[model samples]
Target: MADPAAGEKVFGKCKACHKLDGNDGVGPHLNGVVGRTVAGVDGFNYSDPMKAHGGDWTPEALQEFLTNPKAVVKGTKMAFAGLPKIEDRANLIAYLEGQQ
Candidate 1:
């Protein structure tokens, strides 16, 4: 659970669509999302499909989702291809988990 420089670098690809705080950009904010409900940010407009997920974002869940967003939740609006490396996924989750 240390800092993830690789993941931070990888997250640059998401900068255009997402934000670390709860701000609603192209995508929803990611801060405190590790344990949050899917598409549950207070004011963000989530896709109908995302809202239908009806679940929380646990570490394991986020790892799988980060590995392949479409695979974990079909019809999500996110457009990134996905992270293939397990370590990168772990690191990315770590970085996001520490944002708050």
Candidate 2:
């Protein structure tokens, strides 16, 4: 069971660059991104690496990305270091899942 509250807290680190609403900012808006394809967010300018990557942001896939962003998608624009904790990652994913 993931905790959305805790996830929101952890998400503070990401809010500066990412938004839950469908508006692109420093990074792409994450609204309804759980099953969304990588680099799928509209309007935001994406890197070639992300554009080259494929597949959706499923929970499992998100976990891998959040665990090691550089390892998951090298040359990506997202600069935040990974959560590094499974519990934190799960909670954050839960929070993201609830955004829609």
Query: How would you encode candidate 1's per-residue C-alpha lDDT over 1-100 as one tens digit per residue?
Result: 3456776886787778888856887888876777888878778777787887878888788778887887778898788777787777777787777774
Clashing pairs in 1: none
TM-score of 1: 0.86
Residue pairs of candidate 2 with colliding backbone atoms: none
Best-fitting candidate, scored by lDDT = 2
lDDT of each candidate versus the true structure: 0.78, 0.84
Q: Which candidate gets the maximum TM-score versus the true structure?
A: 2
In model 2, the Cα lDDT at residue 46 comes to 87
Give the local distance difference test score of model 2: 0.84
Candidate 2 off by > 4 Å: none
Clash count, predicted structure 2: 0
Q: Which 10 consecutive positions of candidate 1 have the poorest summed lDDT?
A: 1-10
Q: Residue by residue across 1-100, what tens digits does model 2's lDDT show?
A: 5998998998898899988766788888876888988888667898888888888889999999988887788899888777878998988898998885
On a 0 to 100 scale, what is the lDDT of residue 49 in model 2? Answer: 82
